[PDB]
Design a protein around this ligand. Structure first.
Ligand SMILES: *[C@@H]1O[C@H](CO)[C@@H](O[C@@H]2O[C@H](CO)[C@@H](O)[C@H](O)[C@H]2NC(C)=O)[C@H](O)[C@H]1NC(C)=O
Lengths: 107, 97, 49, 238
């Protein structure tokens, strides 16, 4: 059992800003992590997996980083449709545990 | 799984299964290596913590501490003896006691 | 006249610290052959049944 | 150094057998009654002749472990039985050490980090008595904590030492030394085979014992298997 304790509870930003979301684990999930975008009213979608990868279809502005215990997801060209909550699902231990969530607003 | 043997004492070694404890019946017992036959009953004897089993004057084991639960059990050999037939003589009757 | 024993019982201390083979044969992700991983299991009661 | 006499001290339980009101007689290693034991007050290395009787009256925790071995090097093991403020560690490791080893981390562990085998943690105004022997690859320790006050020599009385734990090290030991907390009176006595007549009371606790080789009266007591004898002539030995 591994718990997701990502530090940013919520981040305030606007269009054309820089936002970094840091996810924290408790054991060796060094290269088994995924990121998801959850727009209200619809199912989540995958954008980053294996802590460094780009899903086929997503734009080239979301980049995963970090290895070991800490993991950071960074965006450099924030766009209004990207405003949602983010989760860092693990993949090391088989009982996968999702993340708490991180809301981003319009400011 | 690669096992290996060495002069050092073994640290990984197999388990020892146990049977449920029964009393008031002559049953063979193996209490942590003590082998014998007798009737096991609850005992009021007071054992020191390190002491494991008791002996009598004639060096015959009488009390043993159960390994799983720290309680004292008295070992009593199950009954034996002789059989004697009481008869009034076949010249009078064939009924015996 | 002699009564013979009816059952045979054996008592041994509680089996504790069973060996951790559960992780080895059940882990979600095993290693690639070139990097075979070695786990030294020690000080334990091992049951292969 | 100084010589002091042990007056009926160093009797332990030779086995884990419960005996009630039995005058058992046993043949094992015991410290002879009324035998001189060397007094130390500083602490060099000492031999290990089949067993050693350790007694320390220090009220502080300066005495905090012991070391054992025969030709102590990085190739052979050693007994590290140091006493921490909250626990103890049983470190049997193939290490050597420099001269004058002690504890202030340890002063001897500077070079004592080679090929260690087995580890264990068991143990966390009065007299501390310890008996150490190593037989058939088993190391046995007996301890007793008796309150002694305002007495110079060993107290006049009887106290039975109870075993702590037996450890299967299975190595050779010839030299013995304590690890004094260098940041000091303790007695040493050696055990040789002797015949003892232990007296168990109704609770299984040893109350008094007789040394079967001290004087003819004790041999007479041992022959009759009683602690008291009556008027008469008794044949004891040949
Ligand atoms: C050996 O295992 C048995 C089985 O659990 C233990 O028995 C229990 O001990 C606890 C501890 O006090 C009690 O609360 C339970 O009621 C006991 N259950 C039974 C069925 O006896 C036993 O204590 C263990 N012994 C040791 C030395 O660990």
């Amino acid at each position: 059992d591994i718990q997701m304790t990502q530090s940013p509870s919520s981040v305030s930003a606007s269009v054309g800003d820089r936002v970094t979301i840091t996810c924290r684990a408790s054991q060796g999930i060094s290269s088994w992590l995924a990121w998801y975008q959850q727009k209200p009213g619809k199912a989540p979608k995958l954008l980053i997996y294996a802590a460094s990868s780009l899903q086929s279809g997503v734009p080239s502005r979301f980049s995963g980083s970090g290895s070991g215990t800490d993991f950071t997801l960074t965006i450099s060209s924030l766009q209004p449709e990207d405003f949602a909550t983010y989760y860092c699902q693990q993949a090391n231990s088989f009982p996968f545990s999702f993340g708490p969530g991180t809301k981003v607003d319009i400011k | 799984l690669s096992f290996e043997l060495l002069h050092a004492p073994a640290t990984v070694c197999g388990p020892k299964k146990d049977c449920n404890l029964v009393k008031n019946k002559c049953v063979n017992f193996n209490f942590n290596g003590l082998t014998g036959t007798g009737v096991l009953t609850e005992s009021n004897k007071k054992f020191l913590p390190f002491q494991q089993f008791g002996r009598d004057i004639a060096d015959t084991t009488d009390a043993v501490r159960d390994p799983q639960t720290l309680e004292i059990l008295d070992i009593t050999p199950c009954s034996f003896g002789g059989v004697s037939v009481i008869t009034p003589g076949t010249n009078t009757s064939n009924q015996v006691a | 006249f002699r009564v013979q024993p009816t059952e045979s019982i054996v008592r041994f201390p509680n089996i504790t610290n069973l060996c951790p083979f559960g992780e080895v044969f059940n882990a979600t992700r095993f290693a690639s052959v070139y990097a075979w991983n070695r786990k030294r299991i020690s000080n334990c009661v091992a049951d292969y049944s | 150094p100084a010589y002091t006499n042990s007056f009926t001290r160093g009797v332990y339980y030779p086995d884990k057998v419960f005996r009630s009101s039995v005058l058992h007689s046993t043949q094992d290693l015991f410290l002879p009654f009324f035998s001189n034991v060397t007094w130390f007050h500083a602490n060099p290395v000492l031999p290990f002749n089949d067993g050693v009787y350790f007694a320390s009256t220090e009220k502080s925790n300066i005495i905090r472990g012991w070391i054992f071995g025969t030709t102590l090097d990085s190739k052979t093991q050693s007994l590290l039985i140091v006493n921490n403020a909250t626990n103890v560690v049983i470190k049997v490791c193939e290490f050597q050490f420099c001269n004058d080893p002690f504890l202030d981390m340890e002063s001897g562990v500077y070079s004592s980090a080679n090929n260690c085998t087995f580890e264990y943690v068991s143990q966390p105004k009065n007299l501390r008595e310890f008996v150490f022997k190593n037989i058939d690859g088993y190391f046995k320790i007996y301890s007793k904590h008796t309150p002694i006050n305002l007495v110079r020599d060993l107290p006049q009385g009887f106290s039975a030492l109870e075993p702590l734990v037996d450890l299967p090290i299975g190595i050779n030991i010839t030299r013995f030394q304590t690890l004094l907390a260098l940041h000091a009176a303790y007695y040493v006595g050696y055990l040789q085979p002797r015949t003892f007549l232990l007296k168990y009371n109704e609770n299984g606790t040893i109350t008094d014992a007789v040394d079967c080789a001290l004087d003819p009266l004790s041999e007479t007591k041992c022959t009759l298997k009683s602690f008291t004898v009556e008027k008469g002539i008794y044949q004891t030995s040949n």
